[PDB]
Amino acid sequence: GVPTCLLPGSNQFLTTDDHSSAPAFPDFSPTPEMHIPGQVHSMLEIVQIESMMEINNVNDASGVERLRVQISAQSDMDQLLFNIPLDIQLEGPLRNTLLGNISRYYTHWSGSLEMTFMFCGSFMTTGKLIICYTPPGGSSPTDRMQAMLATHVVWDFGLQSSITIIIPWISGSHYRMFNTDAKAINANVGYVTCFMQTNLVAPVGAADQCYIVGMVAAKKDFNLRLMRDSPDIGQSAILPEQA
Amino acid sequence: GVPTCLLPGSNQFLTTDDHSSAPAFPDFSPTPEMHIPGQVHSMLEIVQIESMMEINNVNDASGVERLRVQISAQSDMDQLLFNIPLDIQLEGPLRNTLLGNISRYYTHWSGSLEMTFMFCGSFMTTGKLIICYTPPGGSSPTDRMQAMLATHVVWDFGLQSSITIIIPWISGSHYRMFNTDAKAINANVGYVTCFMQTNLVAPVGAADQCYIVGMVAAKKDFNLRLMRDSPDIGQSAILPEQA
Amino acid sequence: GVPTCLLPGSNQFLTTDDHSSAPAFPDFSPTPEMHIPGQVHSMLEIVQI
Amino acid sequence: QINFYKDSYAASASKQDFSQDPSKFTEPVAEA
Amino acid sequence: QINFYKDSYAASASKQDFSQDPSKFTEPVAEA
Amino acid sequence: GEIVKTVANTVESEIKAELGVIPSLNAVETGATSNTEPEEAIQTRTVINMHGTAECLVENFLGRSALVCMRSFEYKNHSTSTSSIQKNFFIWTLNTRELVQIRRKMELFTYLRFDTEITIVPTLRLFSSSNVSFSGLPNLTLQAMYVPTGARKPSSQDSFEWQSACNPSVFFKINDPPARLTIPFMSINSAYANFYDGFAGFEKKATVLYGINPANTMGNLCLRVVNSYQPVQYTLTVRVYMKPKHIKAWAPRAPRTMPYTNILNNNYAGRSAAPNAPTAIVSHRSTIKTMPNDINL
Amino acid sequence: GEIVKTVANTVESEIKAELGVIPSLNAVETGATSNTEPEEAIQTRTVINMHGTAECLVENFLGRSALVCMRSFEYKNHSTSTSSIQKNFFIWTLNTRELVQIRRKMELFTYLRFDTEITIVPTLRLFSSSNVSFSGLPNLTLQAMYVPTGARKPSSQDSFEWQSACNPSVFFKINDPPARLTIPFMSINSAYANFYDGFAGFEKKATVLYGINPANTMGNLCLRVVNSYQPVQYTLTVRVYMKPKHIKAWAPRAPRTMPYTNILNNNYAGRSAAPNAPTAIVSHRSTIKTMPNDINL
Amino acid sequence: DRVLQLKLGNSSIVTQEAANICCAYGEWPTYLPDNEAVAIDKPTQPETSTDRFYTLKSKKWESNSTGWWWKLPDALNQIGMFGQNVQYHYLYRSGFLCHVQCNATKFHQGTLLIVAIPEHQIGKKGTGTSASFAEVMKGAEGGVFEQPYLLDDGTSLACALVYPHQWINLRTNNSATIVLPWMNSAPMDFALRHNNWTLAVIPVCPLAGGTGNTNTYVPITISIAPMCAEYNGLRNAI
Amino acid sequence: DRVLQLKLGNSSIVTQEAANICCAYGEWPTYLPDNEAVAIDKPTQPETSTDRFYTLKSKKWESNSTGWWWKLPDALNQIGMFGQNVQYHYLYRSGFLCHVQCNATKFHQGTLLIVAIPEHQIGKKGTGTSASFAEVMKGAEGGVFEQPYLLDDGTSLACALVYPHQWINLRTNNSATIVLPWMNSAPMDFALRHNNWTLAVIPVCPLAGGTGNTNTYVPITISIAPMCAEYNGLRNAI
């Protein structure tokens, strides 16, 4: 016969193997292919889609109250309104997102993100905001006089309801980590802060209180590398037929 | 030697495998091929052959009485004469057929059927019947005023003894199921009903009572897909040499 | 390595098999062929007698 | 098919025979 | 890919499909 | 004979009220099956159907490995104070009739020609003796010997008929993958006959049985445990699986409805009641106007 | 659709103060995702990026072998003073919903078409009886038989439904490498549906359940110990691993956040508190101005 | 068409109410080809003393008749030079043309299924013992179906339409014709111990009539013609 | 642009504050191709008696409203010749154009997410029993979200933007239009037992106004047009 030696890793089962296997139903004719809308070829197509962040992830907020940040006319100036921890891996606003959910099936990532903030006030409510992305290295800014030193976009309300700030890929390494440690140089992305630029101004007939909805998505330079079981879903027993 | 790794599913016995195997009788010369009539290449050749349905599958009918539906002159009009459950999988008229027996070795099916009904009365017995196929969704019709709204053929007796109604393939899915549940959307085919169109009329010298023989077959669009052990034949012990 | 699956009837001994097998005496030179009368190639030659 | 033995009958299945003539059974009549 | 069996569905993975059209989901608007 | 890989396509049809053209009518008395088209009985649309037919081919319908035999014997010392014969072997006369699924599939055809593939699957167990530790399952060497008709049979484990100098024999172990080999088409005729309307002998007596086919004198499989008896018991069960190859089938059949009662004939006792009773094959419904599974809303 | 093996390169951009050009502004109400480029929102440099995208392809994201079932049964003599039935077998109705990782990955898409690869991994142990020496693990022969819907099931180890003349069955041993085979795409439809907004029956009653897909009547896997019972006990655990192949996915989904409570529906009870509570999916922070992981120096 | 004439040797059958000619499996009896032959001895091909219509005894069609079967060549093994070529020869090969006759008035109703079954092995009800030689070999007399609904077998009459078949529906038809080729796994056979075609006549719908036409004497007649008959192994008569 | 007119059959909808037209997954409803068809019977394509705007009942937008969903084709299964082609036919196929209307003053604020979810299987909270027929099939009346934050499912509203969606932000928009193709694994479906698109209207930001503009009566109106509708399996009405 043909001489043969059986190498290590011969008889085993590697869940990531890729081989042909015996067909149980020989000559089976599967149902003809049919055009169905929305065919997905890559998961990078999905993370490119906007999805809301739970910026108001606070105890007092329940349900849809968590998807909208609440903005009011200020009696002060230069005031911080809200922040966003860019920790995808940890329990933060970006977790419950397409970017967050899908990326969390992976361990490494790279690429620019976009945050889009849509103003949900009155046509009569005007205002200017400054949204700043601060690369890592220090505290999260609390003063607009420092946040503006970083990447920022001033957002004037108007007929265009939304503003996009790009969170540029600013990393020493080609990739970052979905690590349990937020403060590791390989994992942290920085901070996104929002300050008042002038104020929120609404006339008497309009509400003084307004909502901003934040959505995040990946850009076309986004990459996800090392696959893993998602920590979001868990199990302690085989799911039964009745609860 | 040649490096080799032994994949999962190596040493096993899959009853549907397809490989060459050692010849026990080397250089054996089998008996020469000889022309025998009726060579079969596909089982779709067989289900295309007509075969009687046990339409009169009732307790009071024994044997050949079950293969013939009994038709009489009516004193009423528009009356239902008989129905046919199209449930191949379940115990119905179509089970004990070539279509039924052979298809029951399979789990999925598709294609049009034909029912042929042959009048076995007198040359003097005239009449018109309306045979209706009702797609699924509701009750089986009991009134000709509804059955005619579905697929139907009016059948006038004459020198041509038989009528064919095509049960068209009307399904959302490419295939249906030989499922234990008759009322599942994947399994049910509808209903076939027969009503009087005018009446059965026979002169005094001829019998007032007449027989119709129903036969069913598949058409050339018929397909059977997933193979299975037939539920029709069973066994509790190895068949002995003496009963 | 080369992927491989071991089919049924792999490790067995079928007395009618027909394969090459390891030579125990490598490079052995068998005695030269010599013409001997009455060479038989088939058993149908014998039943004809 | 595929075969690793001399004998033709040792070969694998021959499943490439898609011919059909139901007329042998559905129209076995001399005159059409 | 690679296959040692007749049936096409027995074959190994088909991982050479690098097409992307996110516009189906990111710009699903009639007018650009 | 046309080639049919995919089922027929459907052609578009329009209204039709022509005289002299009656496609839905036909004459069953000719022995012919209705040639009525869906297109001329109803109004149809154009359907390009790509559904395959490969899986109704007789090569696939029959070309599946099926159990044809299952024999067990006790692997022990059968020698007593009188006889020395060892009996850790069984002899099986080959047939496709001991198990009904394979039997009925291939009684769907009058004549079959097929080279057949046999796979032997042995399984051991330890017999529950009065006091025996389950000390594991030995890797015994089994010998399956094909004994063609007219050859002398082994009547013992130690018999010298087991040389298998001429008889084909396969040696395999418990732990090894199941034994396999291909038996050719061996009928003295051009095909196996699943049914034989006649007698296999030239004599008229009662001992010449009806339905026995002389060409189906198919020989025997003798299987032995080559290892001699252990101190303790084992029950060896051998399942033989048989797979027709290169099938060629003739003259389809009326499918069996009654249960099989034996392998020597096709006699039947039937069910007590429907389904599959002699007087009632299909189960009952109250009336011909009754829907057992009527959809109620 | 353009080909994307490597992620987008970045182009160099300069200062810009043009009127009528507002790239960072956009209209979310259109349903469209922001098309703002990094190049026109900030000043960028030229970056030639060679990072691959192969490992986010759905073939790789889904094409990993995942546990879908884990059944165990006691391999022993189940015969009592009353019943002879042997029960060293289990029957599993096939589904991708008993284990959450595989379930949720593939509820990320509404419709999937994939030929699936099944690997069966059996493991034995010796049951800790009142008094039993650990006399080793036998090399039992197992039989996994696919029973398509409508076919009769085995209700015993010794049943004759196990012929598997038609049903595909695979025989494998404990010590051999795990059994493997490829099941094709079998839906009567063009794709499997992970979600079905409807009812699988024509009737209205309560017994017709919401979310049950008729096309997902996917049949059953019956697994048996072919070896008959040993004198002593063994607990056979079978893990079935399933690997989609040639996947084709449609209509991505909102990912599951609540735990699964069952396989017949997508109902949820939720966490007591965040994370993954019905009122709070993401865990809390004190205020929208609070950094839980603020860097302190 | 319906009017048909069958001229074989001396014989000539006319029928003015025929359905058609059923050629079993589309074949037409032929003589054994040289490349299919086995027996080397030269065959005898009488061609007119055997290949002719042999009309068997008629059966009375009752309102309760189960059905009749005739086994071939058994039915003809004593009739004419056909039987005397069978008796004097070990080996036999032929095809058969079977013509069944049944007339009734236009006021009568009924339906006969005329089936030619290959290798119709008769299974018997309520016993494990195989059918005896006498219960199977009845010759020109033929046999009667105990269980037409199962074809005196574990099979069904409903699925009997796989076999070469014709009906005699008295509305449409009074005669049925089936052409039977040589149907065997061997190029020949010993005609005295094996039958290859069973011609079965089974009433599916009973013979009935109206007032005054009840209980009419309606016979059923079988005419069988050997076709391309050849015999081999000439020896003494058996 | 923002000004839009939709002319379908009899109907014609104008809106002067529109965002755009959302074509779900970039598709545009088409009739079933011949090579994708399954049912051989000829389909009926009314093209004007069905393919037209059907305006459903209006919902009142409260400051505490959770959201509303309408299931298709269920919502239209009794409205017009569309419903009467569904009732009289076993099989159904169509696309839908959904137009949602909500006006408010420039002094009002609010935001509606208009989502068209395919195969939106409703999971229910605090029970293992599946949703009943009544709680799922509400027709033109539609349903109300118990849990908009989870989409009456174990999923999330944040990630609902995968689905074909538009917003009605009263600053920018008063109407949203989504074009829904045929979204199924089968070329047809039984319209009375399966819904393929769920149109969900969910307030993400509550309706609010300032002094004097509080508690304004702001309705939400749904207009749905079947698109390229075709029916098959003509039978009696169900």
Author numbering:
A (entry chain C), B (entry chain C): 1 to 243
C (entry chain C): 1 to 49
D (entry chain D), E (entry chain D): 28 to 59
F (entry chain A), G (entry chain A): 7 to 303
H (entry chain B), I (entry chain B): 11 to 248
Extract from the study:
Enterovirus 70 (EV70) is a human pathogen belonging to the family Picornaviridae. EV70 is transmitted by eye secretions and causes acute hemorrhagic conjunctivitis, a serious eye disease. The capsid of EV70 is composed of the subunits VP1, VP2, VP3, and VP4. The major capsid proteins of EV70 are organized with pseudo-T=3 icosahedral symmetry, with VP1 subunits forming pentamers around 5-fold symmetry axes and VP2 and VP3 subunits forming heterohexamers at 3-fold axes of the capsid.
Cryo-electron microscopy (cryo-EM) was used to determine a three-dimensional (3D) reconstruction of the virion of EV70 to a resolution of 2.63 Å. The nonenveloped capsid of EV70 has a diameter of 30 nm. The map enabled the building of the structure of capsid proteins except for residues 1 to 6 and 304 to 306 of VP1, 1 to 10 and 249 to 250 of VP2, and 1 to 27 and 60 to 68 of VP4. In contrast to EV-D68, the structure of which was solved using X-ray crystallography and cryo-EM, our reconstruction of EV70 enabled the building of the DE loop of VP1 that forms a protrusion around the 5-fold symmetry axes of the capsid. The lower local resolution of the cryo-EM map and higher-temperature factors of the atoms from the amino acids forming the BC and DE loops of VP1 indicate that they are flexible. In contrast, the pocket in VP1 of EV70 does not contain a continuous density corresponding to the pocket factor. In contrast, the pocket in EV70 VP1 is not completely collapsed, but the side chain of Met224 of VP1 partially blocks its central part. Thus, the discontinuous density fragments inside the pocket may correspond to solvent molecules. Whereas the main part of the EV70 pocket is formed by 26 residues of the VP1 subunit, the end of the pocket pointing toward the virion center is capped by residues from two VP3 subunits. Therefore, the pocket is accessible only from the outside of the virus particle.
